Every structure is written in C-alpha cells, then in structure tokens.
Amino acid sequence: SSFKAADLQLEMTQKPHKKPGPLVFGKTFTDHMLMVEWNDKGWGQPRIQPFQNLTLHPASSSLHYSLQLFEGMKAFKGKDQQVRLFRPWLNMDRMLRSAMRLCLPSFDKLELLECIRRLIEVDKDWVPDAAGTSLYVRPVLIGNEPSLGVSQPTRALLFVILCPVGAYFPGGSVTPVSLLADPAFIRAWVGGVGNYKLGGNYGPTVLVQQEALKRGCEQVLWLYGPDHQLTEVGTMNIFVYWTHEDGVLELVTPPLNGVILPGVVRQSLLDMAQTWGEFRVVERTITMKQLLRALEEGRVREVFGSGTACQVCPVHRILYKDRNLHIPTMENGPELILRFQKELKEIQYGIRAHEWMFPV
C-alpha cells in the first residue's frame, strides 16, 4: 500500500537560498525536496523537507549493485504565473515500470504526482518565466539494503529534487550537432533494460561520448544490429523526416522493440504529427544503408533528437566508417523542427489550452 499525499509532512527551510539572477543544466537546486522511505513496515509518510544530503550505509545496494532509477520532466510557468507540468502521468507510468524491473517497491502514481505537485507548489517561486526557461524535476528511486548479497532490497528511498534551467538555445534558435556512428559501442540489447530509465544505462556511455569528442563529434549515434540500425542519439530519441523509398514523405522514428527508451517528447512529436494529418508518421527500423541511399538521392529533409532537457535538437553531420555524411537539416528550415518547437512552446506555456498540461 502506497504512501499517501494526505500524510504529507512539511518542514520549511530556515534560510531560503538566493534564486539565480548563465544557469548550467542540473547543477543549481531549489530549497526543498520530497523524500519517502520504504522498509518491511511498507512506505513511511512522504515529506517535503529542506534540500539536504542523503545519509546511506556504506553497503547500500544503490551504490554496489545499481538498484537505482530516475525520471525527468519539466514544469513551465506562463505569463499568468500559473505553473504546469508536461504530460507527467507518462513519467509516472515509466517510473513504475522501471521500479518493477529492479524489484523496487511499487507506489501509487497519482499519490506521487500529487506529492510532486505539492513540492513544486512549495518552491513555485523557483520556476522561472523567461523565454525558454523551465524547472527540471528529477524523481529518483533507489534500493538501500545494507548487504553485499545480490538480492531484492528490503529497504528503499524515493526522493525528488528540482533544478531551474535556462534556455538550451539562444532566443529559440536551434543549433545542430555532429554525431559519431561507430558500431563498436552498443547502448542496449533486445532482452536487456535499455527501454527503462535505469542509472546503469548511463554510466557506461560517458567514455563513449569522450571518444566521440576526440574524433571531433559532439554526440553518439547509437547503432544496433549487423545492419546498423539507428536507435538513439546521446540521451535523446532520433527522428528522420524524409521521402521514403516508396516516394511517400514521412516522419519516422525507431519502434519500441526493446533498445529504445520510450520518450515523452518522442511520443508527443508522433502525436502532433499524426494530428496534423499532413504526411505519413511511422515507427519503423532505420538502417544506415537506407540513410546513405536516401542521402544520395536527396530525399532526407531533417534529422533530429528529442528529449526533455533539450526538447528537439537538429543534426547536420554523421561520421560513419571514417566518412563524414552531411545531413541537410538546417537547409530544410529546419521547418518541421521549428514547427514542433512552436506548437510545444504554445502548449507548455499555456498560450493554447491542452490536456497535456497538468496544473500545479
């Protein structure tokens, strides 16, 4: 039986910290945090407490066997100062799937969402309202068994921290990135856990990113299979806007076959494009073979990443088999990207009412 929002204990900070005035992503945090403990007596009472360190037993399974998962979603403040979360129910669904996959304790998705609402409500003055700004919300659930046996934990901690974030692009002007496409590096496997947002999926990628930077590329294009399927780009889902081999203009993204993290932005872009009804929208495997041919015949319009922190990011270059492939995204507007960006902005900041937004 879940923790309940009705049982929320509150403790306000003695000295509130000074809000920012050049804000680096995920390094500046708000005054408060959510915390819930779980043990053999079930879930304790959720609490909003001042931001503070975690105290953990040195054998905590969070630190030895990676019993850890997280989420990431944004809250946006409109002109009327109303704060809204973007499609948070989907992050809750995803968090619960991750928790089950790691044998961590189940919780009630709406009870968590309400606790998170109360938390953002407490720190509402931390949500900025300038162009391209938002509050990043980082829920985390960790095992906390003081035992070196690889086992299902009998203790766990669930916490939530918040970070104001600035505009990823200057004045809403998307800047494109180069990608390294080397099949030696494999992010995730069918049957694995690449489709869950587990800490374990990220640490091994840090050296890969370093190797991309050494080869003059900004991010990693994650390839999979003997046919070099394009799966994800960095920590973002990948989209291609092109005329397909059958002559039909389409937006394509790889399907959810196990090696793809099902992004909330990804699903939202698919939803928006289907709603327009102006071109084919499909989830299909994308191979480097298909991409190279389409690039020779001039059929590729736009390539981009999607994800909460950066929203939509264009791609202009891919290094594959030591050969640079120019991707004509910025030449094609990038009008699909600019259109998505505009419609999402209107929804996120309340310019258009939308059921996707959850009011705080």
Ligand X SMILES: *Cc1c(COP(=O)(O)O)cnc(C)c1O
Per CB under 6 A, the list member of 149, 170, 203, 247 interacting with ligand 4W4 is 149
Is residue 202 at the binding interface for a copy of itself, with CB under 8 A as the rule? yes
Report in angstroms how near the CB of residue 9 gets to Cl ion at its nearest.
35
Nearer to ligand X among residue 177 and residue 236 (C-beta): 236
Alpha helix (H) residue ranges in 203-324: 206-214, 264-276, 288-296
Q: Which does 219 bind (CB under 5 to 8 A by kind): ligand 4W4, ligand X, a copy of itself, none?
A: ligand 4W4
DSSP single-letter state for residue 245: T
Is residue 213 at the binding interface for ligand 4W4, with CB under 6 A as the rule? no
Report in angstroms how near the CB of residue 44 gets to ligand 4W4 at its nearest.
27
Is residue 220 at the binding interface for ligand X, with CB under 6 A as the rule? no
CB neighbours of residue 318 within 10 Å: 24
The site string for ligand X over 39-78 (x = CB under 6 A, - otherwise) reads: ---------------------------------x------
Q: Which does 176 bind (CB under 5 to 8 A by kind): ligand X, ligand 4W4, Cl ion, none?
A: none
- 5, 32, 82, 298 from 125: Cα distances, Å: 22, 12, 11, 49
Joined together, the tokens standing for residue 14 give 């003695």
Is residue 191 at the binding interface for a copy of itself, with CB under 8 A as the rule? yes
DSSP single-letter state for residue 198: B
Question: Whole-angstrom Cα distance, residue 329 to residue 251?
Answer: 13
**Local structure of 274: helix, strand or coil:** helix
* Sign, CA torsion 170/309/29/204: negative
Name the binding residues: 136
Is residue 308 at the binding interface for ligand 4W4, with CB under 6 A as the rule? yes
Q: At what angle do helices 335-348 and 264-276 cross, to 10 degrees?
A: 110
Of all residues in this chain, which one has the CB nearest to Cl ion in the complex? 256
Q: Which does 206 bind (CB under 5 to 8 A by kind): ligand 4W4, a copy of itself, Cl ion, none?
A: a copy of itself
Name the binding residues for substrate: 136
**Local structure of 125: helix, strand or coil:** helix
Q: Which residues make Cβ contacts (< 8 Å) with residue 269, sequence separation at least 6?
A: 239, 251, 253, 306, 312, 340
Per CB under 6 A, the list member of 8, 212, 261, 294 interacting with ligand X is 261
Is residue 35 at the binding interface for ligand 4W4, with CB under 6 A as the rule? no
Per CB under 8 A, the list member of 1, 15, 210, 355 interacting with a copy of itself is 210
Per CB under 6 A, the list member of 315, 325, 347, 360 interacting with ligand 4W4 is 315
Among residues 320, 298, 304, 308, which one has the least CA distance to residue 261?
Answer: 308
Per CB under 6 A, the list member of 61, 68, 133, 219 interacting with ligand 4W4 is 219
C-alpha dihedral (123, 128, 132, 134), degrees to nearest 10: 0
The site string for ligand 4W4 over 154-193 (x = CB under 6 A, - otherwise) reads: -----------------------x----------------
**Residues 301 and 328 sit within 8 Å (Cβ to Cβ):** yes
Is residue 334 at the binding interface for ligand 4W4, with CB under 6 A as the rule? no
DSSP string, 88-112: HHHHHHHHHHHHHHTTPPP--HHHH
Per CB under 8 A, the list member of 12, 190, 248, 351 interacting with a copy of itself is 190
Is residue 23 at the binding interface for a copy of itself, with CB under 8 A as the rule? no
Question: Whole-angstrom Cα distance, residue 238 to residue 240?
Answer: 7
Nearer to ligand 4W4 among residue 236 and residue 281 (C-beta): 236
**Residues 111 and 3 sit within 8 Å (Cβ to Cβ):** yes
Binding positions for a copy of itself, rule: CB under 8 A = 24-27, 29, 33, 51-68, 70, 72, 100-103, 136, 138, 140, 142-143, 146-152, 159, 161, 163, 183-186, 189-193, 198-207, 209-210, 235
